[PDB]
Amino acid sequence: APPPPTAMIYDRAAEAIKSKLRQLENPDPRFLKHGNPRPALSDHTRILAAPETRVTTLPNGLRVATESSLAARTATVGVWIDAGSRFETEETNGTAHFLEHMIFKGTERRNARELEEEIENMGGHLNAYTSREQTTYYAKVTDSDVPQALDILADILQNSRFEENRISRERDVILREMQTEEVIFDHLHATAFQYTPLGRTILGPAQNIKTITKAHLQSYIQTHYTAPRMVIAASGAVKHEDIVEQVKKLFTKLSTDATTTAQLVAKEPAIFTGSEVRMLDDDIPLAQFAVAFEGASWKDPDSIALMVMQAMLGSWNKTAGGGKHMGSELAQRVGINEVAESIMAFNTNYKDTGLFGVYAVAKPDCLDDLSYAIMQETTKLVYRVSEDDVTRACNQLKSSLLLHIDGTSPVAEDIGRQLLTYGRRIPFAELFARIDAVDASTIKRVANRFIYDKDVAIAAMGPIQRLPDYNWFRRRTYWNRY
Amino acid sequence: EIPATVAAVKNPSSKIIYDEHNHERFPPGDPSKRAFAYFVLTGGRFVYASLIRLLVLKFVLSMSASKDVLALAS
């Protein structure tokens, strides 16, 4: 006589698992009414309403842009300068970094201690950073401290005095400051834009760092911090008229040089040369490599298509909650096979050129398969692309671009960066129209222009011994199927 | 006393020097000349396709009928 289903252990386990599976075969429409996994285009015009960004041009070429939200309690005021580490010379490479370190530590009216006390007393704090083509000094304060923050910013930009004993200490602290992701990106930039200003690293070599003096910093300020390349971006509880009046009163005696960033870029421009830098050590547990093509300029109409292509090559992480069900095919390939610790597609835009590629961190054993997956997906975007995939990428790009702008400081950063790059702040509606005007045909055309049979630049560090060499990637750039 | 590899890794320099003993690089800025190489390879492929085709036809026609049996047909 057959025993009952509860008699033996495995029969009980089978009954339990069958019962567990039987309680999820029946969903209910009330929990599936609005959700839909298939991507679909949407019209966000009714919600894409933001306070108007008022832009005023002073007679000396200075720009003042404000996004006013008077209901807010805090506001941020910052100065964005279109001069970075690219517009320097070979003899003065670390000057931008040295100046951004030395600009908060001395003025003819306030010393470093007094300046830090004044910053701390009003609660707000000021930060600064220099990119390869931009330099920003911004300050977040309460709405009542906006004039004080603006006065401090003008004072540090103009009346700054560089004490020699402070220059020596900052040189020492920089030499002390002498992730590996930034190292990989610096090597990639050097090996891609070699013998061009973008090849040089932002921080600069120690030999040029050691010789930086007060005269060099003063000359750099006088020759690059000129009013036409200078924009004061204010966001939050500020008034445009008050900001313009304070800027007119304070930002005087600024440098006025006829040389423009456009002509500086036109002279000795940046040229992408396919190359690779391999730094095999095998002493690091993980291997990190980045393969990048040539991107598009800031004002290039294909830049938005490049951002969409990045979105459809989205990043994947070992700790990511998406797992192996991500939208992008590259993330699915990496997650399903677990061939990488973390992959991320990057698209960097510059004045006349750019980079577009994938940076990956993986175990030494899976390097070949991971590189094959990366090249396969990239050339797939080149050849055949899915409409639903493009729609999902566009939706993700719009959502990310609007989620990043959450706060007065992000709003001011967007204002300054967009004025420095595009010459204007792109409205949300126009940006959405530009993004949604990108389809499968546009993706194919842009990938053909930028990827198909184009030289790559590969910067790799770690146990890169199974990583395929340059000819492998160059051949994988195109498909011979058709 | 710093290792050469460590110094090279920690100092990414824009000025990159290659071997150039038997391969003179193009000056930095000129576009990649990939069309010319592809067309040289295309001429070589013209040659290889001709050889493969003639070898295959030679073998097939050798296995085909002969002049003796062709003439005996009358």
């Binding site: 055949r384 199927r481 058709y482 | 396709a49």
Partner: peptide, 24 residues
């Protein structure tokens, strides 16, 4: 793709006409 398949069929036909060479 339909166009890719058609072009590959054209290439195969060209190769066959190069090999057999019926009426050149």
């Amino acid at each position: 793709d339909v166009k890719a398949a058609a072009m590959w069929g054209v290439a195969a036909a060209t190769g066959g006409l190069y090999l057999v060479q019926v009426s050149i």
